[PDB]
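FAQ: What does a ligand-bound record look like?

Like this one, built around chloride ion:
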Amino acid sequence: HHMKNVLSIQSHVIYGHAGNSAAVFPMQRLGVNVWPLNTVQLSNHMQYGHWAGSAIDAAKMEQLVDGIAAIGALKRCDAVLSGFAGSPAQARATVEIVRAVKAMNPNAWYFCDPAMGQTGGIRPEPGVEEFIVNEMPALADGMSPNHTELQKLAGRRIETVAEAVDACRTLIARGPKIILVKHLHDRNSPADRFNMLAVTETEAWIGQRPLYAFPRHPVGVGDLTSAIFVARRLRGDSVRAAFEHTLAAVHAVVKATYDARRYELELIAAQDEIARPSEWFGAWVTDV
Amino acid sequence: HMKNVLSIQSHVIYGHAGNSAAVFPMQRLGVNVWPLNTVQLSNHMQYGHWAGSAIDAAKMEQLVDGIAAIGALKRCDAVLSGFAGSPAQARATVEIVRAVKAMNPNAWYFCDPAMGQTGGIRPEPGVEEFIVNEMPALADGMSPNHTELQKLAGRRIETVAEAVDACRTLIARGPKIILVKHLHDRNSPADRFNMLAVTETEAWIGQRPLYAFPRHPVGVGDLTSAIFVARRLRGDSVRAAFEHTLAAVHAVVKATYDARRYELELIAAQDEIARPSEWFGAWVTDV
Ligand SMILES: [Cl-]
Ligand SMILES: [Cl-]
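The answer part, i.e. the structure of the complex:
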């Protein structure tokens, strides 16, 4: 009955839902305490084409976390969740925060959502992408790449489920115990399916939910996906159960957004379905 | 018909104060919140030490300008403000309210004076003075505690009827609704926490149990104002919004007290925020 605590190190968007504005409320609604460290405050998502923002630097990130430690709270952190990093220095600061939390609490784990934004190519771009690919797997207990991010982490083109499982297993050999492929581009899947995968050293699960066609795809679905998975794991779910709850909860939010003809996620409207999804999509076993 | 509130307050990473006490309860009550964080603190200042980052008044206006630039400001149904660290920040909040009301003339501004530890009838120069002198003409609702109400009214207030009259005099200055988020009633038993809600035509007094914490939790005032704002946005009557606020705040405070914690048990008590299991019906009062 002990409440778990997650330190969530992500961007904050005032209007709309991305980063901590997509992650904090769902985890709280799922019964987990969230300590949101906002690395930047943006007026709105960058996909609108223009925005205003204010960021903190890496030194300030460390100072803020020092404050949480000074009152004795940081050692009670049960998990760290990271997302978008605005600069290489911020990504390095995230790693140092994770190292401190894990040394204070040997049961704490780090879940890294690469959160590379709009990008492409197998090669990691210099700076943040390079740092995510080269440095983060060594400390991460779980990672939640989308397809593009998985190709960068693995250094490979990936087109099938089996190729993706193999890429996940190679990444797991670098450190992480679980890879949640939060969106998989499966050339063998029907076009109206949204595919996800959950891979550990000994398990692999495929899941599918309906793919909704948006004029512009909502930002924040990846951040929401990682957050729900983390919260369900903290609530004690097995890998399969956390995976299935994530798939079903994200479906409910995305469907609500589509039915409302909206671009920003219908996160608050769909909150009861985040906590207790009504429609379920059982996963099935796959392998290399 | 989802409503949106722009909440302009401090953010605290660990624990619950400002937006870290206001945003989640309003969301849990079915209202969308756009949080504009004026500062980011590691923890609240009552611990004695803390770290913080901050934005200035110009950046606050620039951030809202960004929302306006994508055409979203017309979707703002209310603005909620609380503690202000400087007169410049309070003036930036006023400019933001003006910008919101230009895009949505139906939007309303709810000001929690949030003066903190203070005393006396005279407002202190600077922020307190601005709240007393300039805020009522701009705010559609205000949630003073007892000390703040005395400063707003320029009067000593000791009875419920005196407090209603002070609220009515303040309402004649601009606001449509006053929530006295903690009322000092010399005729009430010491173990009662009194609140009052007043409009030009209604006045409701209510009570929940007063708990004697060894160190009183921070953020109860922020939680109270936020729940009331959310219930009003959901369309509650004055009395219903008032009673839900009293019962939901009780549930959170009781949960915190029962666990002997300092930080509010906000997430643990979330179902009681939405559906309080113990109710404290209000009663009519007047001048
Ligand atoms: Cl912030
Ligand atoms: Cl109290």
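Follow-up question: can I read anything off the structure? Yes, for example: Residues B 193, 220, 253 surround chloride ion (ligand 2) (CB under 6 Å).
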